[PDB]
A paper describes a structure:
In the crystal structure of CrmE10, two identical molecules were found in one asymmetric unit. The CrmE10 structure was composed of 12 α-helices (including three 310-helices) and 5 β-strands. The N-terminal region had a compact architecture that was mainly composed of five predominant β-strands (β1–β5) surrounded by eight α-helices (α1–α8). The C-terminal region was a long α-helix, α9 (Ala184–Asp203), that extended away from the subunit core and wrapped in the other chain. In CrmE10 and AlinE4 structures, catalytic residue Ser was located on helix α1, and residues Asp and His were located on the loop between helix η3 (CrmE10) or helix η2 (AlinE4) and helix α9, which were typically different from other esterases. Interestingly, the catalytic triads of CrmE10 and AlinE4 were not composed of Ser, Asp, and His from the same chain, which was common in other esterases. As mutants CrmE10-S29A and CrmE10-D178A had no activity, the results showed that residues Ser29 and Asp178 influenced the enzymatic activity of CrmE10 by domain swapping. Thus, dimerization participated in the active sites of CrmE10, and this mechanism might also fit AlinE4 due to the similar architecture, which was different from other homologs. The region of these five sites in CrmE10 formed a negative potential surface; however, the corresponding region was full of positive potential in AlinE4. CrmE10 had about 30% activity at 4 °C and showed no activity above 40 °C, which indicated that CrmE10 was a cold-active enzyme.
Residue numbers in the entry:
A (entry chain B), B (entry chain A): 12 to 205
Write the structure that this text describes.
């Protein structure tokens, strides 16, 4: 079933945030490494460089894109661009993300490097207006720069919670209240006893 | 129902990580702020200082405990100590978390500041051996230093997903495989077409 890779080496740069970096995974388990393996199994002589940085916003990506590109052994043949999630999770304006991704795409145009734009979706609790403004960044910019759009690539995670890390729990406001109800009697006693 | 607080202020220092800092929450929604409100409703004249820092390991906490204490207007009457989760989540050695928490409790003993130790439990991703060495840190150190143990105060979060932030999804290794299966055909086509 597997096809031996042949042909000249194809350098792919995976430029993104935690979803490329492999948050809390071994580097060889991250999306860029596993994608490399799957492409090579199909006969493509591909090397994927993992330039994912957990926590990167579109601003942080723009700040380092030229350096990351310069640091490769020649220009890459293809860039995978996956940023925006951290802007949304931090409540930064959708317009700033759009502008920073636009600039990144301008820089790749200037270097004649083709790109695939990985789309991202805003959390529902940011409201419908933010959702429409953020979610449309990716198809709009893919269209403007004649890049392919990759649909939300974490969609499998939405439909199978077993595919999502469950080790790290952050409370909502109501979760905090439950934590207080569970501890206030003990803390009250301790303070009263000082 | 509320009891008006009376008497001199009682200063409580909440020294911890994201479970005290209020990760992606407003200040008034964090555990230290909600704990303060609950205690004052019961008639205690308490001021809880939120010294939570998201991301803090036991080593990071040890590094800043003296600076944090030396920056208060007088020493606190009580410290709530809540660290270890980030050591665990990063697979850092349980023995080093134990040693750092021990040193913190030693410095608090030396300043005669009472302490409540907030226990933490290792995630299942860490395996049984790690869990047994990590989970015992908190009752062991609470007994050694004659401090109270607050058992596992995020217990309500484990059992009710509605109390836990769901906006940030990180794949397991299996989740990454699913993301590759969702995108490989499109990436293969784009590389083939270069
Ligand atoms: Ca003492
Ligand atoms: Ca002592
Ligand atoms: Ca003494
Ligand atoms: Ca084709
Ligand atoms: Ca084609
Ligand atoms: Ca195509
Ligand atoms: Ca070709």
């Amino acid at each position: 079933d597997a096809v031996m890779p042949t042909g000249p080496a194809i350098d792919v740069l995976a430029f993104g945030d935690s979803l490329f970096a492999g948050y809390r995974l071994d580097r060889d388990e991250s999306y860029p490494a596993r994608l490399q393996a799957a492409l090579r199994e199909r006969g493509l002589n591909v090397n994927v460089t993992n330039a994912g940085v957990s926590g990167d916003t579109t601003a942080a990506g723009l700040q380092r894109i030229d350096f990351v590109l310069d640091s490769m052994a020649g220009e890459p043949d293809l860039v995978l661009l996956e940023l925006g999630a951290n802007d949304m999770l931090r409540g930064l304006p959708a317009e700033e993300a759009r502008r920073n991704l636009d600039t990144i795409l301008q820089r790749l145009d200037q270097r004649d490097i083709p790109v695939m734009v990985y789309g991202m979706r805003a959390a529902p609790n940011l409201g419908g207006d933010y959702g429409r403004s953020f979610d449309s960044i990716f198809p709009d910019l893919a269209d403007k720069y004649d890049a392919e759009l990759v649909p939300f690539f974490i969609e499998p995670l939405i439909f199978d919670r077993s595919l999502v890390q469950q080790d790290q729990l952050h409370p909502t406001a109501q979760g905090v209240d439950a934590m207080v109800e569970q501890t206030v009697e003990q803390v009250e006693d301790r303070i009263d006893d000082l």
